[PDB]
Write a protein that binds this ligand. Structure first.
Ligand SMILES: O=c1[nH]cnc2c([C@@H]3N[C@H](CO)[C@@H](O)[C@H]3O)c[nH]c12
Ligand SMILES: O=c1[nH]cnc2c([C@@H]3N[C@H](CO)[C@@H](O)[C@H]3O)c[nH]c12
Ligand SMILES: [Ca+2]
Ligand SMILES: [Ca+2]
Ligand code: NI
Lengths: 327, 326
């Protein structure tokens, strides 16, 4: 029935909406673990939010508990500090601090505390009986670390990697004085690791770059519909996180917030989310204006990556609204 | 219960303040509210005021009341990032339950017709008993009323409980052109502030940063609303505070405080804090200290009762309990 999945995320709002999608769809996904990286959040906050959401869901829908580990990966280029604070706010949301759920997390916290994110990813994959799908909604540093340490012994156990990252035929979202805006943030955080992943042979990769994520901006109308399901803990949770993003486009002309990681996780639940196109992907790692950019390379026999195209937005929007009703 | 009118500018503490005043029907009869385009975008701030009112009306004995948008304009606008918080609340699921949004949609046309400043003037003056004005945004609207009606307006005011200024502590307006002595609410419109604090015949209770600095919004307390998720107001208040606990780390010590909430608590119950009389003047000049509240030696200068040593635990318990109103 369900396939094994590990969520490799960096604790922002869409990372958590992504978590809820994967966790709530028990018929399609068997969530066997998660790791949080100190990228688009402060790892301690992301770690606790991951734990709190898991416990809330364990008590309300019998979701099997799984290991959560903090990655030791460090940044090449850190995310803006303002974005990394979001996990802190979520750690304090009343919906994630219900006594029975917080009590459970407190009971299993010390154990998960002992895990090192990167080694955990490698063990969950390599020790799994069946192959494992890795959903990467943060930087690629952990998959790369596993690839460098274990090579084929690791990749051969990977069903596929579904990745939120990049921008192939559309501009990126990294706008700084020294960049040209063609790079996307997850790749930009650790270019070298991304390149390692995208160049790895014997590894299936599904890539959700901005080309596809640009079709799902977070808008008020849709977000307010979660207000129709306040009887469900996950709807209060998902709607709240989304409600915290509807201002972005207004704050930075058009450079709004999108359901990046959410759309990516949705594909893991049901590939009908989008079709794909094979593309040889390389990553600019030098200190150039487009550092972090994902570009097609025509190097001989370069491994292919399946780039998502023309996502089924309506299907995705209905999936999220109904998944937020699992409990 | 005494008649109260909330004069706010739509930020997170403004809304918690609103909940505090509205939920305590035993001490406060909330007869109206106005929102100013200051620390929010008036449309979002107006709409959230409406959404909160209807949520409460439909779940507890809270009479509906008029809500108006102020025509006041800024001298020095708030930071855009801060003004977006009302847009965020506007889309929160707890404020978008069908039954409450339907009510709001139904009474909206009546309220979106009121002019905030005139509404404040009419509510105060035509009231049978005297009215207490809780000001949690700039002082533009009370000044407008003073300018237009003078004594006819002030004589009907029980007292103005104002969240604003900094007297013996550093302010919180940190900009390239400022020296940090000014507090945001006064800074937004110095001249209106000057008018109110220099008004003879008007009683003023001032909650300056001197007292609000004892109430930073911190994680441990915020998480306690998690023990009350069966009450809509706890989900609402806890969610708003949860969106503030980050400021201290982001702004190196310059965190978020329960500024307007503390001010409002005192209206509910004065045991919240004692007061010291102080001649409060305001700097309106385009200097590095524009918007500063300073003691003046001028003879016959009207006194203002500045809050001192607030009862923190008392205030904190009041909010948690009030948050269980529904
Ligand atoms: O404006 C933003 N706020 C918070 N996170 C992101 C991101 C993060 N990077 C990825 C998309 O660029 C996605 O995983 C998301 O969590 C891009 N822009 C923002
Ligand atoms: O960092 C901030 N974010 C949002 N609002 C405020 C304020 C507003 N100004 C008053 C306190 O200085 C109070 O009414 C509050 O709503 C000061 N600092 C901030
Ligand atoms: Ca992410
Ligand atoms: Ca305010
Ligand atoms: Ni009614």
């Amino acid at each position: 029935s369900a396939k094994n999945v590990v969520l490799d995320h960096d604790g922002n709002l869409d990372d958590f909406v992504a978590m809820v999608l994967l966790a709530s769809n028990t018929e399609k996904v068997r969530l066997i673990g998660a790791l949080c990286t100190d990228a688009d959040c402060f790892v301690e906050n992301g770690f606790n939010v991951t734990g709190k959401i898991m416990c809330l869901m364990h008590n309300n829908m019998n979701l099997p508990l799984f290991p959560i580990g903090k990655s030791a990966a460090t940044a090449v280029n850190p995310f803006p500090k303002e974005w990394r604070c979001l996990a802190k706010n979520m750690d304090d949301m009343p919906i994630l601090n219900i006594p029975e759920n917080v009590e459970l997390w407190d009971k299993i916290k010390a154990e998960n505390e002992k895990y090192e994110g990167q080694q955990l990813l490698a063990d969950l994959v390599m020790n799994s009986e069946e192959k494992v799908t890795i959903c990467v909604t943060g930087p690629l540093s952990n998959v790369a670390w596993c690839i460098d340490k274990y090579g084929e012994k690791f990749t051969s156990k990977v069903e596929e990697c579904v990745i939120m990252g990049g921008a192939v035929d559309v501009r990126g979202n990294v706008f700084l004085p020294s960049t040209d805006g063609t790079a996307e943030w997850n790749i930009y955080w650790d270019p070298a690791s991304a390149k390692t992943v995208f160049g790895c042979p014997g590894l299936r990769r599904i890539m959700f770059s901005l080309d596809s994520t640009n079709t799902v901006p977070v808008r008020s109308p849709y977000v307010q519909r979660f207000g129709e399901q306040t009887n469900f803990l996950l709807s209060i949770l998902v709607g709240t996180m989304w409600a915290m993003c509807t201002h972005c486009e207004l704050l930075r002309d058009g450079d709004g917030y999108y359901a990046w990681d959410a759309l990516t996780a949705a594909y893991v639940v049901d590939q009908k989310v989008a079709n794909v196109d094979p593309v040889p992907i390389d990553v600019v790692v030098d200190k150039q204006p487009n550092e972090g950019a994902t570009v097609r390379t025509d190097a001989e026999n370069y491994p292919l990556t399946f780039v998502a195209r023309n996502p089924e937005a309506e299907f995705f929007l209905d999936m999220l609204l109904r998944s937020a009703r699992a409990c």
